[PDB]
Amino acid sequence: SITKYSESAGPIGQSIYTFTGVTVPAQYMPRLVATTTVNKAGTNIEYKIAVNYPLVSVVDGANVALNTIRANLSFTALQSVINTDEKLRVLDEIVSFITANKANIIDGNVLTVT
Amino acid sequence: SITKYSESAGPIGQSIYTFTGVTVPAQYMPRLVATTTVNKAGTNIEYKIAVNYPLVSVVDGANVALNTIRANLSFTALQSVINTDEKLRVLDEIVSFITANKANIIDGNVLTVT
Amino acid sequence: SITKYSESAGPIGQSIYTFTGVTVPAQYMPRLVATTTVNKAGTNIEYKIAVNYPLVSVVDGANVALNTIRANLSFTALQSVINTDEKLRVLDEIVSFITANKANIIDGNVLTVT
Amino acid sequence: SITKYSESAGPIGQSIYTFTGVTVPAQYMPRLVATTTVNKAGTNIEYKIAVNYPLVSVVDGANVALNTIRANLSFTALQSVINTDEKLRVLDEIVSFITANKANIIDGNVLTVT
Amino acid sequence: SITKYSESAGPIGQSIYTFTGVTVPAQYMPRLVATTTVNKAGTNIEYKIAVNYPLVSVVDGANVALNTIRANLSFTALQSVINTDEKLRVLDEIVSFITANKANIIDGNVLTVT
Amino acid sequence: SITKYSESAGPIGQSIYTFTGVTVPAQYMPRLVATTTVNKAGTNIEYKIAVNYPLVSVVDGANVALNTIRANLSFTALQSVINTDEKLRVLDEIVSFITANKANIIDGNVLTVT
């Protein structure tokens, strides 16, 4: 659940989305930023997904973000070969792993949860 | 669908998993590697998910990987504050975005698919 | 009474609307353009409303804009704080003042009409 | 809802109004100021509507305006043509747009609310 | 027979389509790209239709595009006059000429085929 | 509907045709000019179709071209290879796209008409 904030008019650009549930001033609004960048050789495009979730707190009557939750993701969408089943397999496996082991990812625990 | 390859006995270590479906020599077997590393200050642990999918090809009767599909992911599991709903929100939103826009992520296309 | 011409993809962008009554070549078509621009610091967003109304006349077989009626508005939607009541107070007072003193604003008269 | 504070001597000049509901010291008093200024060439007169709404807060037991809501609005009352219908069209279209999309203008959102 | 890949956000922008029948990697994918660009003076907008058809070949067991078929087509959608009948005349005459003499255009032959 | 004015001697040259309907002095007669030019390397020939349509009006007793509608096409008829099916694919897709989206190409609109 994220709504649009800024969507590049080109297929290769940077789109920004804001989180829905959070009710804070929009400067400290949690965001997800997708960014496609083309290789100089034109061999692949890199897809970048950056989530920042500022933890807003109040000190001396001011809004400051003592800590911030960040999550970065990158993918090499190769343009020199179409192996679409394999690219989808990579994305599916990483998504499946995050969903399954989410409970321990949030705790800094590499062990499988079962 | 990934089976274990090497699982660290400590909650902070490196676990390696191999893809199931692929039938190639295991050196070029596609893999997913999770890695928790602790901050020097002990403020957070970083969770790292690295997928490599080698594209095996045969040249002059030899197995070589002309290209390779890579996907990297990092998460800042902050230990100084427990905001568990918010960490889960970050992971959920990034997973939801990948699942929804997968068709264009594999193409190097930042635009939304709808 | 304005007809949509360009809609912004997201909340940060540019929308262009054309006046409905006029039937004139598109260069001299009267338009209203709304534009949100994010501050470099990300402290606020500025909303810009720009209305141009060219007063066409025909010379030598082509339309020319002797003069042009322009009206511009700029509002600082602060993103550092959420003060929705006060922000709305500002817009409402501007609108109330215009609608009340419209007859004199048109003639370039700052005096209150009573 | 504005209280008159200073009226202009003639049609070309400056009038100052304060916000009614606000009861704060005059240094942080939100105001709406109308100002007609004659072009050097005398081709048009310009009507300027400037609203300042200082957001009073208290730091270290002292009154400080951490932020301020500002809004400006200019109209070219052309003196080289009397096109009262067209000028009214301009001013009415901008007022109608502001009233309709007010809920999104205050948030720095260019999308139409429909 | 073209498949949509990227549509423009507004009427002024860029849309990208791929050729349907071709199944090759995206680096050598034949495409048709339409692009509207506004003149600096705003006198006209220009419509650009650009087709690239890379001729895939294999050298030393590697995919290389030895040659590439390129075709460009520009139209001045004048904004200073609405002469829709005349613009249609222009565009129709050029399309009809291309369709009629296509068999010789492909060979670099300016003579009419009759 | 174009009447022949200059025919090229051979397949490499220039042909000039005039529009049929218009009855205007020859400088401002709308014309279609096809031109094959051989590359210095002799790798390909470029076919160039240039349509000019002057919008005449009379001033001070003489015709003048206030504005002009232009439309240009360029096709790279490669001479290094014979790929007649693909070369025809290119021209056919351009023609199909124009005839399908003609109404929007005229208005300078990149969006598909559906």
Side-chain angles (χ1 to χ4, degrees), chain F residues 39-106:
Chain F
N39 198 359
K40 185 180 177 181
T43 52
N44 87 346
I45 299 172
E46 198 171 5
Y47 200 98
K48 300 173 182 179
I49 291 168
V51 183
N52 59 355
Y53 193 105
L55 308 172
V56 299
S57 58
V58 55
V59 303
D60 294 336
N63 288 111
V64 297
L66 46 102
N67 289 110
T68 304
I69 304 179
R70 293 172 186 170
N72 296 318
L73 183 130
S74 67
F75 179 72
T76 67
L78 310 159
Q79 304 274 283
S80 49
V81 297
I82 42 160
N83 268 114
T84 39
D85 283 335
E86 292 75 35
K87 304 186 199 171
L88 281 151
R89 178 73 175 275
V90 172
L91 283 180
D92 283 328
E93 290 300 340
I94 296 182
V95 169
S96 177
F97 179 90
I98 306 151
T99 52
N101 300 303
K102 187 179 307 183
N104 285 334
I105 296 175
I106 294 299

Side-chain angles (χ1 to χ4, degrees), chain E residues 2 29 36 44 61 74 85-86:
Chain E
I2 49 179
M29 175 67 71
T36 49
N44 95 346
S74 63
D85 293 315
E86 285 79 355

Side-chain angles (χ1 to χ4, degrees), chain B:
Chain B
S1 64
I2 51 174
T3 56
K4 294 180 177 179
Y5 184 86
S6 166
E7 177 177 356
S8 69
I12 295 158
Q14 172 171 337
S15 293
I16 310 172
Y17 309 106
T18 58
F19 284 11
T20 55
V22 179
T23 55
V24 297
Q27 180 183 5
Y28 309 98
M29 181 73 70
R31 288 190 279 184
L32 161 58
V33 172
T35 303
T36 51
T37 49
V38 182
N39 193 3
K40 186 176 178 180
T43 52
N44 85 337
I45 301 176
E46 200 181 358
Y47 204 102
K48 299 174 182 179
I49 289 176
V51 182
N52 57 356
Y53 192 104
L55 304 178
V56 182
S57 58
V58 285
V59 298
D60 291 333
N63 282 323
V64 301
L66 292 178
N67 290 105
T68 298
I69 305 178
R70 292 176 186 174
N72 296 318
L73 174 81
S74 66
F75 180 80
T76 64
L78 305 156
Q79 306 284 323
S80 53
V81 294
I82 44 155
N83 296 139
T84 52
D85 295 322
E86 295 80 351
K87 307 169 181 173
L88 295 176
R89 174 77 182 274
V90 174
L91 286 180
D92 282 330
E93 284 300 339
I94 187 170
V95 161
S96 178
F97 183 91
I98 303 160
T99 50
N101 298 303
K102 186 176 42 177
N104 282 125
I105 295 173
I106 61 162
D107 282 339
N109 185 3
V110 69
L111 298 174
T112 65
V113 55
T114 48

Side-chain angles (χ1 to χ4, degrees), chain E residues 5 9-10 24 33 48 55 62 67 77 81 87 95-96 103-104 112:
Chain E
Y5 178 63
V24 300
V33 170
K48 301 175 181 180
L55 300 176
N67 290 107
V81 284
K87 309 176 186 170
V95 173
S96 178
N104 286 335
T112 51

